Design a protein around this nucleic acid. Structure first.
Ligand code: MG
Ligand code: MG
Ligand code: MG
Ligand code: MG
Length: 52
RNA sequence: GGAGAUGGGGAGCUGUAGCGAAAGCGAGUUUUAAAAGAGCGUUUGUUUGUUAUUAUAGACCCGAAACGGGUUGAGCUAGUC
């Protein structure tokens, strides 16, 4: 793809960088993405609730 | 590594060949003198997430008369001095 550089002033570079096709995948998986987000949200739990 | 996602870590676990108590043999094996007959095999995996059931824990909640171990009581009362 056309991934292009950014300078400090906010103007764009005139030379875009080509991208190897291995990065972009023609097949997208959404269920593994959902499970990854859920396990990231989990393990953030302190779990210090206690009752007698 | 942030009380992280994760990376390293292949120790192991399931499946890949089964049969027999076993030595053993092996797409065959056990029984038997038998190769016949019969039994079992000659294929469909694994790791997670969710739900249902189940096993160990008190295991849906409330309820005994009880049992065992320790301490406190003879200012009431019973006896004795
Ligand atoms: Mg790990
Ligand atoms: Mg046969
Ligand atoms: Mg599968
Ligand atoms: Mg008295």
């Amino acid at each position: 793809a056309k991934l292009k550089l950014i300078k400090i002033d906010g103007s764009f570079e005139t030379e875009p960088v080509k991208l190897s096709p291995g990065l972009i995948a023609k097949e997208l998986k959404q269920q593994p993405v959902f499970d990854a987000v859920l396990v990231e949200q989990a393990s953030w739990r302190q779990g210090t609730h206690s009752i007698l």
